[PDB]
Amino acid sequence: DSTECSNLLLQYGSFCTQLNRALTGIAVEQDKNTQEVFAQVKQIYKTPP
Amino acid sequence: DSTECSNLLLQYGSFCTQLNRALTGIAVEQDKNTQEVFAQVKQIYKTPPIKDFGGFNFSQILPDPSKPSKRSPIEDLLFNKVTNGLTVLPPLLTDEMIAQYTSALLAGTITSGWTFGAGP
Amino acid sequence: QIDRLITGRLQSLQTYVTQQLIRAAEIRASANLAATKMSECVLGQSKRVD
Amino acid sequence: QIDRLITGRLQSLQTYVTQQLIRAAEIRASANLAATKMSECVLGQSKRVD
Amino acid sequence: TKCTLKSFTVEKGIYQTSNFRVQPTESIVRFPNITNLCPFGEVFNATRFASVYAWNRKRISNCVADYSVLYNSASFSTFKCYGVSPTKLNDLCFTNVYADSFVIRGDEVRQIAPGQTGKIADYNYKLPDDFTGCVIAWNSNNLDSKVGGNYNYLYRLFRKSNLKPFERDISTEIYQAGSTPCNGVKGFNCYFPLQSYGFQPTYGVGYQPYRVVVLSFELLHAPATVCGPKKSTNLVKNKCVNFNFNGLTGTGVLTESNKKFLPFQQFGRDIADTTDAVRDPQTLEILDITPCSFGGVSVITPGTNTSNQVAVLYQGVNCTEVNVFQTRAGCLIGAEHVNNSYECDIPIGAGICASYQSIIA
Amino acid sequence: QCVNLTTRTQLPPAYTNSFTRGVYYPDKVFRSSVLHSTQDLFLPFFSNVTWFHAIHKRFDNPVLPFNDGVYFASTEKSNIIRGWIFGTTLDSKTQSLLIVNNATNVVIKVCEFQFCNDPFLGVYYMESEFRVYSSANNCTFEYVSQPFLNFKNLREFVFKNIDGYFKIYSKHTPINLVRDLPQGFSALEPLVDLPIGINITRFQTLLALHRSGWTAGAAAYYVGYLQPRTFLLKYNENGTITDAVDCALDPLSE
Numbered sequence: 001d002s003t004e005c006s007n008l009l010l011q012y013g014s015f016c017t018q019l020n021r022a023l024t025g026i027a028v029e030q031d032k033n034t035q036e037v038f039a040q041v042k043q044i045y046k047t048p049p
Numbered sequence: 050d051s052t053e054c055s056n057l058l059l060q061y062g063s064f065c066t067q068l069n070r071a072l073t074g075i076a077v078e079q080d081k082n083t084q085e086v087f088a089q090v091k092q093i094y095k096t097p098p099i100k101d102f103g104g105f106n107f108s109q110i111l112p113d114p115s116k117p118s119k120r121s122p123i124e125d126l127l128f129n130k131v132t133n134g135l136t137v138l139p140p141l142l143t144d145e146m147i148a149q150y151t152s153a154l155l156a157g158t159i160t161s162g163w164t165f166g167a168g169p
Numbered sequence: 170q171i172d173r174l175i176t177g178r179l180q181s182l183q184t185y186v187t188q189q190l191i192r193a194a195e196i197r198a199s200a201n202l203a204a205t206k207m208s209e210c211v212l213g214q215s216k217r218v219d
Numbered sequence: 220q221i222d223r224l225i226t227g228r229l230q231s232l233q234t235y236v237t238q239q240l241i242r243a244a245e246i247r248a249s250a251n252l253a254a255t256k257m258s259e260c261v262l263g264q265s266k267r268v269d
Numbered sequence: 270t271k272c273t274l275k276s277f278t279v280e281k282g283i284y285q286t287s288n289f290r291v292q293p294t295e296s297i298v299r300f301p302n303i304t305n306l307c308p309f310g311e312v313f314n315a316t317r318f319a320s321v322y323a324w325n326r327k328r329i330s331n332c333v334a335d336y337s338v339l340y341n342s343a344s345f346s347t348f349k350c351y352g353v354s355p356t357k358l359n360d361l362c363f364t365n366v367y368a369d370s371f372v373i374r375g376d377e378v379r380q381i382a383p384g385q386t387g388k389i390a391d392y393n394y395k396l397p398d399d400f401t402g403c404v405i406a407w408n409s410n411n412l413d414s415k416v417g418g419n420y421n422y423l424y425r426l427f428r429k430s431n432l433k434p435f436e437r438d439i440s441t442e443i444y445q446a447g448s449t450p451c452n453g454v455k456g457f458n459c460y461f462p463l464q465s466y467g468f469q470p471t472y473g474v475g476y477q478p479y480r481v482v483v484l485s486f487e488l489l490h491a492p493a494t495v496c497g498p499k500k501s502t503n504l505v506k507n508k509c510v511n512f513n514f515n516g517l518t519g520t521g522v523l524t525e526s527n528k529k530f531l532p533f534q535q536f537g538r539d540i541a542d543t544t545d546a547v548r549d550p551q552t553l554e555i556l557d558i559t560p561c562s563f564g565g566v567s568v569i570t571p572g573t574n575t576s577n578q579v580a581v582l583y584q585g586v587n588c589t590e591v592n593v594f595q596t597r598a599g600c601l602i603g604a605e606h607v608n609n610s611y612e613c614d615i616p617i618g619a620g621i622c623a624s625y626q627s628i629i630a
Numbered sequence: 631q632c633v634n635l636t637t638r639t640q641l642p643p644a645y646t647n648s649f650t651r652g653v654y655y656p657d658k659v660f661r662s663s664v665l666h667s668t669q670d671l672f673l674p675f676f677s678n679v680t681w682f683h684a685i686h687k688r689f690d691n692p693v694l695p696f697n698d699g700v701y702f703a704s705t706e707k708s709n710i711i712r713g714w715i716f717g718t719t720l721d722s723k724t725q726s727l728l729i730v731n732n733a734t735n736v737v738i739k740v741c742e743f744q745f746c747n748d749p750f751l752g753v754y755y756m757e758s759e760f761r762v763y764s765s766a767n768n769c770t771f772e773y774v775s776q777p778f779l780n781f782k783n784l785r786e787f788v789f790k791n792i793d794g795y796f797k798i799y800s801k802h803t804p805i806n807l808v809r810d811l812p813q814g815f816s817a818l819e820p821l822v823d824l825p826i827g828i829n830i831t832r833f834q835t836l837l838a839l840h841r842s843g844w845t846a847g848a849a850a851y852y853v854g855y856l857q858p859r860t861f862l863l864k865y866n867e868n869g870t871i872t873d874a875v876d877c878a879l880d881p882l883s884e
């Protein structure tokens with residue numbers, strides 16, 4: 001929460017935006033991986049009783 | 050163009066050489082990728098002038114002779130739908146030669162089946 | 170003093186993000202393999218040995 | 220002051236080259252997949268499901 | 270290539286070895302018009318100068334000051350600075366200038382100095398120990414002196430205490446030389462403090478009247494309105510030159526521009542925040558700044574076991590700006606272009622390849 | 631010379647919407663077909679701006695705190711608004727800035743003025759009444775320039791005190807709306823930068839009387855306050871700012 005630290009950190013440019021963008025890409029890539037693996041059918045089949 | 054900056058940059062050693070070599074490796078890897086994907090045939094096949102394929106129509110995927118780029122209508126639509134020391138190296142294969150490779154693959158798989166991929 | 174702390178923590182965070190990107194690439198390769206196994210072993214019978 | 224600018228720009232360039240190498244690995248994996256699909260779907264008929 | 274690869278044998282291929290630069294040829298400095306000059310003509314060459322007990326203070330501000338004309342004038346018999354340099358007055362900038370003009374005797378010209386003790390220093394005009402600026406003095410025997418004696422220039426002779434720096438005293442209080450009570454009534458030991466000088470044309474050098482103008486500089490948190498003159502050179506276009514436009518410097522090719530600026534705008538930026546358009550301050554015209562044709566120098570060679578012949582590729586460089594062949598990758602020098610098509614041996618790019626058979630492309 | 635105006639009608643001040651006004655060019659840089667995000671003292675979109683009237687009997691000349699900047703909007707006909715009063719204590723103890731537009735020219739002076747409690751100008755039905763100050767002792771800066779000037783004219787002004795620089799941005803706009811601020815977009819061009827180097831914490835508008843007692847001509851003006859925030863400015867092909875986004879207004883513009 002130090003505002004002097006953030007004022008000094010703004011001198012370094014868009015490093016933080018790059019790191020947040022990379023982490024966001026990883027985060028959506030995990031959901032894409034689960035979507036690709038498990039959602040290979042659009043019909044929810046059920047066994048007979 | 051600052052000479053004092055380059056004199057101070059020489060204190061850090063061969064960082065610039067490593068960055069240039071990594072980018073050169075990426076640049077030749079892209080050409081190797083295109084070579085492995087599209088250049089799977091060493092014979093440039095053509096379709097016959099008469100398009101008698103038993104009712105099957107391939108005009109949307111065969112190259113259009115009226116277009117100067119020699120692209121298919123589908124390939125033309127695909128190319129229309131895609132829009133300080135920095136340099137951009139051009140790719141080794143131009144778009145015309147990649148289109149020629151795809152035309153050869155289409156002519157081979159239309160006129161000869163899977164036989165052209167395993168031999169003559 | 171904050172300049173020293175900022176460059177140390179920024180180097181640590183960049184190292185963490187680089188390791189996470191490499192591990193995410195490895196997990197993406199494993200997930201592509203798992204999707205291939207789901208397509209070819211569960212949804213069909215595979216002639217591929219092992 | 221020039222040393223501060225040099226180390227900042229060098230860190231930026233190293234970050235760019237590292238993420239370019241990671242994206243190059245991803246594109247190489249996609250291109251190997253595309254070459255496999257070129258060999259197995261175009262140059263032949265594939266029994267592999269999906 | 271052997272130097273770059275750190276080896277005495279070079280394998281067949283293309284090797285990026287160096288970086289072609291279009292070297293800057295000229296330096297072009299364009300600075301705007303030197304108008305609104307400081308009124309030094311009404312201070313140094315006024316009609317009547319003031320006395321030293323009531324020295325005239327002129328405030329020089331919100332103008333550009335040409336000290337080269339003042340310094341190169343040979344009429345001044347004394348040009349002594351105590352806080353700055355005379356050759357750097359046209360380069361430095363100050364918030365304001367205080368010009369103190371008076372007339373003194375020729376022997377008292379040295380008394381306007383830091384650390385100097387005299388009657389003019391103690392009672393008429395005092396400088397601080399940390400004084401900055403320049404004292405300028407010149408002889409005025411042809412103007413101020415009169416054959417009947419010029420008694421108009423008065424000076425203070427007596428005061429109880431010494432002056433603070435930059436302090437005026439126009440009071441006419443009767444001095445007490447002794448300890449007798451004086452209520453403004455002159456007596457045996459009570460004299461008027463202001464006496465008149467004896468400027469006459471028959472006196473020699475040392476008693477002639479000298480006109481002195483003292484410039485003092487202030488460097489407060491106010492903006493530096495007083496600056497030196499700017500010597501703008503001629504403008505050269507269509508060449509890779511070093512441009513300096515109103516403090517914005519760089520290297521580029523300056524061509525004519527079709528971008529119509531609004532009148533308040535001076536520079537132009539693209540998406541990537543690089544200055545690609547600019548307005549010349551002398552003549553209000555718009556110029557595009559194209560970066561010089563930097564390129565990568567690549568060497569195309571076979572193996573040194575095979576041959577020592579090489580070809581040079583200048584990447585993204587037209588062939589008129591460097592066996593010369595123009596490719597889309599750049600200009601290729603040392604390879605003979607042929608109309609036949611072979612397999613790719615050494616990749617150049619954009620469908621061009623090189624091989625050895627001499628080097629052909 | 632000072633005169634107390636004792637025929638005013640008591641009324642609370644009004645408030646209205648800023649809409650998308652108050653935008654100015656942050657720098658002297660041409661930009662072509664690009665979107666530029668900038669951090670500066672900007673006026674918030676759709677903000678609560680203080681509304682003052684001059685109508686007959688309303689004569690609104692109070693002293694307001696300057697804060698970090700002042701946006702002055704003027705729905706003006708027949709040139710009632712002539713200038714502004716700038717300073718901290720508005721007396722001879724401190725140094726004050728005077729902006730006046732009389733019948734001939736605009737005069738900008740930085741001196742030690744003795745302001746009246748009720749400063750105004752006056753037009754006789756011909757301008758022949760100047761009662762804005764009683765003295766002028768120690769001047770440091772004088773600057774005479776070209777004149778800046780149903781409601782027919784719209785005058786926007788931005789005054790900023792940054793690092794001893796006084797920035798005046800202005801734009802002239804032809805409007806035909808009767809009462810309130812019109813809704814639209816107009817970026818303010820930079821007119822003149824003043825080397826004043828003085829402390830300013832309070833301000834006061836200068837109006838003009840109509841004599842034929844006194845009568846107040848029909849005028850209305852608006853005071854907005856500049857706050858440090860981010861705008862995303864759109865630059866067209868011709869290089870004028872045609873639209874803006876306030877990054878702290880709502881999550882959509884965020």
Ligand SMILES: *[C@@H]1O[C@H](CO)[C@@H](O[C@@H]2O[C@H](CO)[C@@H](O)[C@H](O)[C@H]2NC(C)=O)[C@H](O)[C@H]1NC(C)=O
Nearest residue numbers: 099100101102104105106107108109110113122
């Ligand atoms: C194959 O398909 C093409 C395209 O669908 C057919 O070309 C069309 O022909 C009709 C009548 O001849 C024209 O009205 C259309 O404008 C044509 N379309 C295009 C895109 O040119 C073609 O007739 C089909 N058959 C053969 C044997 O080529």
Ligand SMILES: *[C@@H]1O[C@H](CO)[C@@H](O[C@@H]2O[C@H](CO)[C@@H](O)[C@H](O)[C@H]2NC(C)=O)[C@H](O)[C@H]1NC(C)=O
Nearest residue numbers: 631632633634635636721745746747748749764
């Ligand atoms: C106009 O009214 C103001 C406020 O009533 C007057 O200002 C006061 O004047 C008296 C006169 O001696 C002073 O004692 C007060 O200290 C003043 N008050 C303030 C806040 O300044 C002003 O003098 C009036 N104008 C005229 C011409 O009389």
Ligand SMILES: *[C@@H]1O[C@H](CO)[C@@H](O)[C@H](O)[C@H]1NC(C)=O
Nearest residue numbers: 301302303549550551552553
């Ligand atoms: C500045 O000087 C140039 C000299 O060539 C002159 O042409 C021009 O009119 C002057 N004024 C301005 C505003 O550029």
Ligand SMILES: *[C@@H]1O[C@H](CO)[C@@H](O)[C@H](O)[C@H]1NC(C)=O
Nearest residue numbers: 308309310311313314338339
């Ligand atoms: C008098 O002095 C001023 C100093 O600014 C100079 O410009 C002017 O030329 C002088 N007059 C003569 C006749 O030399």
Ligand SMILES: *[C@@H]1O[C@H](CO)[C@@H](O)[C@H](O)[C@H]1NC(C)=O
Nearest residue numbers: 644645646647676677678679
């Ligand atoms: C503006 O401020 C006044 C008083 O502070 C208040 O009564 C009014 O509701 C405000 N208007 C808006 C739109 O917030």
Ligand SMILES: *[C@@H]1O[C@H](CO)[C@@H](O)[C@H](O)[C@H]1NC(C)=O
Nearest residue numbers: 730731732733734735737757
């Ligand atoms: C306008 O003001 C200036 C300076 O305050 C003055 O010289 C001029 O005479 C004024 N104009 C009229 C018409 O009084």
Ligand SMILES: *[C@@H]1O[C@H](CO)[C@@H](O)[C@H](O)[C@H]1NC(C)=O
Nearest residue numbers: 722742765766767768769770
């Ligand atoms: C300001 O004015 C007062 C009265 O007019 C005077 O006594 C004082 O010396 C002046 N100060 C300056 C710095 O001019």
Ligand SMILES: *[C@@H]1O[C@H](CO)[C@@H](O)[C@H](O)[C@H]1NC(C)=O
Nearest residue numbers: 717718719724828829830831
């Ligand atoms: C400006 O004036 C205000 C009030 O008069 C005061 O609080 C502030 O400290 C002053 N600032 C400076 C820099 O003098």
Ligand SMILES: *[C@@H]1O[C@H](CO)[C@@H](O)[C@H](O)[C@H]1NC(C)=O
Nearest residue numbers: 529865866867868869870872
């Ligand atoms: C830009 O200016 C041209 C005239 O040169 C005009 O035709 C066009 O409409 C303008 N565009 C905009 C968005 O104002």
